[PDB]
């Protein structure tokens, strides 16, 4: 076989320890899912500083000096775009999950006009900026990030959460060079199938585009897109307009740069697989088909989780509330009305 006695027992043991971890993690998640936290701060506790990217801006807590990234949602706009459930759900998810590569919700509160989610500030900026700057990541570099996404999806899927918006724009690089997944706006707790057309065009699996329902395997497709884009510098399916992107996705004819390793191409053909009976992450062996793939042979999954692997790139840290790793955005004043708006709709926030 591929493995001697020692290796087979070690791998079997490792896979059983994953099961044990996920069972405890689900117990912890469900307690917070069923009894969410609420109203843990208020707006006058913070100084406004700058917009980082709904709108997210850097703030400073006035008593501790700590900086945070505050997501501000206008209740009226949320209603107008039929986003009430999405915004309640995003906060409910963020307060219930716990994993080292998920950015954490530190406070949440609301007032007459807006909803506020105060999250960890991740000052290294988006993977997107770093990827476009360097062009493409080496395969070891891409693999380090990919391994964190694999573990994060293994975690989320065990909770019956589908993430549905993987892309470099939603991955922040922290001061140790590790990934922080941000934005759970399209995540959904689904035990079987769901149907919503949502996500970002380049990253949609064929079965999201098509009328048929879909499941958590769309996230493993999206991982294939992400690994391809990290290693190539561009995604596997693009075009001038989303409609033409969808046509290419559904055809699924993927071509690879000549510098891709054979192991990488094999992994991507198994993730970017139109046929759901064949796509890695969706088979009898589950996430192990991915974790045990040759391209990941050098990956120490526990060491990645423990954040003990040396990162390939450490962002420049220029100070506590420094913003030099982010783009500049137009600045709006953040207005609060004298009259409460949409109170009944946002009771649970």
């Amino acid at each position: 076989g591929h493995m001697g006695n020692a290796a087979a027992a070690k791998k079997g043991s490792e896979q059983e320890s994953v099961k044990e971890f996920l069972a405890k993690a689900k117990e912890e998640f469900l307690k917070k899912w069923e009894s969410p936290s609420q109203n843990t701060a208020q707006l006058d506790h913070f100084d406004r500083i700058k917009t980082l990217g709904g709108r997210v801006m850097l703030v400073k807590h006035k008593e501790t000096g700590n900086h945070y990234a505050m997501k501000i949602l206008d209740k009226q706009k949320v209603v107008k775009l039929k986003q009430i459930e999405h915004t309640l759900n995003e906060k409910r998810i963020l307060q219930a999950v716990n994993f080292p590569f998920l950015v954490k919700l530190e406070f949440s509160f609301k007032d007459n006009s807006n909803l506020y989610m105060v999250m960890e500030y991740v000052p290294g900026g988006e993977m997107f900026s770093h990827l476009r700057r360097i062009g493409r990541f080496s395969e070891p570099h891409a693999r380090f990030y990919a391994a964190q996404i694999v573990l994060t999806f293994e975690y989320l899927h065990s909770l019956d959460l589908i993430y549905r918006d993987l892309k470099p724009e939603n991955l922040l690089i922290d001061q140790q060079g590790y990934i922080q997944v941000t934005d759970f706006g399209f995540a959904k707790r689904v035990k079987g199938r769901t149907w919503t057309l949502c996500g970002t065009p380049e990253y949609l699996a064929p079965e999201i585009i098509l009328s048929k329902g879909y499941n958590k395997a769309v996230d493993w497709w999206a991982l294939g897109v992400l690994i391809y884009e990290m290693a190539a510098g561009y995604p596997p399916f693009f075009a001038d307009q989303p409609i033409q992107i969808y046509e290419k996705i559904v055809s699924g004819k993927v071509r690879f740069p000549s510098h891709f390793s054979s192991d990488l191409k094999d992994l991507l053909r198994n993730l970017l697989q139109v046929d759901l009976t064949k796509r890695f992450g969706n088979l009898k062996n589950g996430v192990n088909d991915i974790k045990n793939h040759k391209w990941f042979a050098t990956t120490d999954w526990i060491a990645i989780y423990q954040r003990k692997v040396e990162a390939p790139f450490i962002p420049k840290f220029k100070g506590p509330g420094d913003t030099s790793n982010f783009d500049d955005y137009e600045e709006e004043e953040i207005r609060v009305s004298i009259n409460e708006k949409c109170g009944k709709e946002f009771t649970e926030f």
């Binding site: 724009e169 399209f186 970002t200 561009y234």
Partner: peptide
């Protein structure tokens, strides 16, 4: 080249989500 086509596509910047 594929890279040149990517540049020409106009989708090299941040990409917005959809929800329909």
């Amino acid at each position: 080249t594929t890279y040149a086509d990517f540049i020409a596509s106009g989708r090299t910047g941040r990409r917005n989500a959809i929800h329909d």
